[model samples]
Structure formats: C-alpha cells, structure tokens
Target: ASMEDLQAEARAFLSEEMIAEFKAAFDMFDADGGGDISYKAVGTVFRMLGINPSKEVLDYLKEKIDVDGSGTIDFEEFLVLMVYIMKQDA
Candidate 1:
C-alpha cells in the first residue's frame, strides 16, 4: 500500500479523540515546531512509552521513516509511524 493509502487508513482506524491524544504527545516532543521531529525527540518519545531504544536504532528509525531524507521526521512520517505501530500492535 502507498503512504497515502495508510494515511487514510489511519484516519479510518483511529478515532478523533485518539488522534488528538497522539497529537498532544507529538506537540510535546515537537518543541522546534518546525513540522518535523529529530531523532533525539523520537528517542525521548519512545523512552517515555517505556520502549527504550539505543541511539543507533533511534537514528535508524528516523532515517527509515524520513523518506525524503530531510534529516528529520515529517509530521506525516510521524503519523505513519503511529499507524504502523498501532497496526502491528493489534
């Protein structure tokens, strides 16, 4: 499936309240407010969720999701990440 497919799929899968909840967590990490997130913030987010990851893997996670390689994870990427995680978790 394409990224757009998953975007819409996530929209369908998650409730408005659920999306808002994730957005709150996202805003907390997105201190830069640059419409993107750094690996550092991603690491902290994961850690906060009790999913500790090594620095190297954190970098990998950011890079892998950063399709455009903009040196940061775009908001879209972050959404896909949550979609991917939740889909897998279920």
Candidate 2:
C-alpha cells in the first residue's frame, strides 16, 4: 500500500482513547517538546519495552519508518509502526 494509504489506515485504527494513550507515549519520548522522537530515543524506548533489537533491525526501522529521512520518528510513523506490528501479531 501507499504511504498515505497506510497512514490513513493507521489513523483509522485508533480510537480517542488509543490516540490519547499513544500521544502520551510519544510525548514521553519527545523530550524537547518537539513533535518527533530521535532515532536513538526510539531505540531506547523499544529496549525499555524489553525488545533488544540488533543493529540491523534498528537500521531497518530507521530506514523504513523515518519517512522523511529526518532521522526522527513522528506521530504518523509511530502509528504506522504500531499498526504494522499489531498486524503481524494477528
């Protein structure tokens, strides 16, 4: 699917509560009050969740989801990744 379509799908998947919860999660990682989480922060958060990804896996996440190549993950990309992970478990 296209990135725009995937982003729409991810947004459609969240309810109000889900959005709030995810926003809180995102805010925790966004130390600068900016709307993005740095690559290093994302990796650290994942590790905090007990996921110890290898360098290759981390690189893949950065390449695949950091859409603008900004080296940071924004809410849209975060939601997209959340949806992707949930779908894999389904």
TM-score of each: 0.64, 0.68
- Error (Å) of candidate 2 at residue 18 is 0.9
Enumerate clash totals for all models, in the order shown. Answer: 0, 0
lDDT of each: 0.62, 0.64
After superposition, the stretches of candidate 1 with alpha carbons farther than 4 Å from their true spots are: 1-5, 46-60
Ten residues in sequence with the least summed lDDT for candidate 1: 49-58
**Clash count, predicted structure 2:** 0
TM-score of 2: 0.68
Residue 42 lDDT in candidate 2: 62
* Model 1 residue 6 distance off true place after TM-score fit, in angstroms: 2.3
RMSD of each: 3.6, 3.4
lDDT of 1 by residue, 1-90 (tens): 445467667766767786676666677777568777774665566556544454455565565766664777666666555665565553
Model 1 / residue 7 / CA error / Å: 3.1
